[PDB]
Design a protein around this ligand. Structure first.
Ligand SMILES: *[C@@H]1O[C@H](CO)[C@@H](O[C@@H]2O[C@H](CO)[C@@H](O)[C@H](O)[C@H]2NC(C)=O)[C@H](O)[C@H]1NC(C)=O
Lengths: 142, 176
């Protein structure tokens, strides 16, 4: 009964609303409890572009303030590293289940009707301005 | 150390080659940040509402090299069923560890009933909602051993029967 929502985390994806100087909130996706987000890191096939031009990120889960400001510091948790844009196997894939209850003590829990936020920074920089960002809305029970 | 690694889940590059049965809705790969804020791959299940869970997870083939006696170190978090609302008839606080000896490097399907049970593994410290709130890991470490082994290698498996459990790491070694 679950379903998965794919999120291609890169600047060319118009759902982030980048390239304009105003993403107006960034990426917005609506999910249900026990649904998944599959996040695909930027990926490049042969012939590879110059190494410096490959998008690479650290993804953070943050509060609203972190989301508004694109600054994760003291505002959230490091979640995932998009550090292999030329991975031979394909795009690095990271999944987030919107579970009620976590089996991992440092994992995360979700509730109907609530909002959750993720942002990226480009190492070695702590903050991207403008950053790519994601708001997830978990539907109310119904 | 005097301990020689035969398999370590944390060192594995990229994705773990492990087979989950069922393939979806049971054990599921989850990437987290470890001790040192670096990434590791974990398997996790929490079907504490629905009855008759029989969720299997099997490693790849592990060579024993020349060792007869091998040790299986499992690090995991396990949720206290009293920290979970509405699941008293169903929630469990143990899982079962199995092994299977094999000369065959690459069996695609291993039948669940070929596996020999090692032990039921319980947690010394089950974690609660205070721990989730306070970001306190309550990491459990459990070690079991198998041997004397007599084939080229073996498979290990983990059977969940309705617990809320995260397998953070698995290390298989022999003693010097
Ligand atoms: C940036 O994101 C876009 C999607 O917005 C990626 O394009 C998709 O790539 C997948 C897997 O390779 C394909 O199945 C889809 O057909 C593509 N979708 C669309 C709408 O074009 C693109 O690969 C990403 N770019 C980088 C460099 O990672």
């Amino acid at each position: 009964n679950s379903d998965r929502y794919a999120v291609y985390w890169n600047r060319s994806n118009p759902r982030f609303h980048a390239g304009a100087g105003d993403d107006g909130g960034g990426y917005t996706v609506e999910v249900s409890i026990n649904d998944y987000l599959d996040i695909y890191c930027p990926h490049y096939g042969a012939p590879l572009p110059p190494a410096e031009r490959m998008e690479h990120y650290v993804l953070y889960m943050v509060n609203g303030e972190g989301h508004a400001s694109c600054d994760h510091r003291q505002r959230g948790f490091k979640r995932w590293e998009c550090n292999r844009p030329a991975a031979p196997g394909g795009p690095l894939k990271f999944s987030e289940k919107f579970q009620l209850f976590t089996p991992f003590s440092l994992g995360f829990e979700f509730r109907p009707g609530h909002e959750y936020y993720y942002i990226s920074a480009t190492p070695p920089n702590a903050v991207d301005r403008p950053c790519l960002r994601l708001k997830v809305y978990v539907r109310p029970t119904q | 150390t005097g301990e020689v690694t035969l398999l370590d889940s944390r060192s594995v590059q990229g994705e773990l080659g492990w087979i989950a049965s069922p393939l979806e809705g049971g054990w599921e790969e989850v990437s987290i940040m470890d001790e040192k804020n670096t990434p590791i791959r974990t398997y996790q299940v929490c079907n504490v509402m629905e009855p008759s869970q029989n969720n299997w997870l099997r490693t790849d083939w592990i060579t024993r090299e020349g060792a007869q006696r091998v040790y299986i170190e499992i690090k995991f978090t396990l949720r206290d069923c009293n920290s979970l609302p509405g699941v008293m008839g169903t929630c469990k606080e143990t899982f079962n560890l199995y092994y299977y000896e094999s000369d065959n490097d690459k069996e695609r399907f291993i039948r669940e009933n070929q596996f020999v049970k090692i032990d039921t593994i319980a947690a010394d410290e089950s974690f609660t909602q205070v721990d989730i709130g306070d970001r306190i890991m309550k990491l459990n470490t459990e070690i079991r051993d198998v041997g004397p082994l007599s084939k080229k290698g073996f498979y290990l498996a983990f059977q969940d029967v309705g617990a809320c459990i995260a397998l953070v790491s698995v290390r298989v070694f022999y003693k010097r």
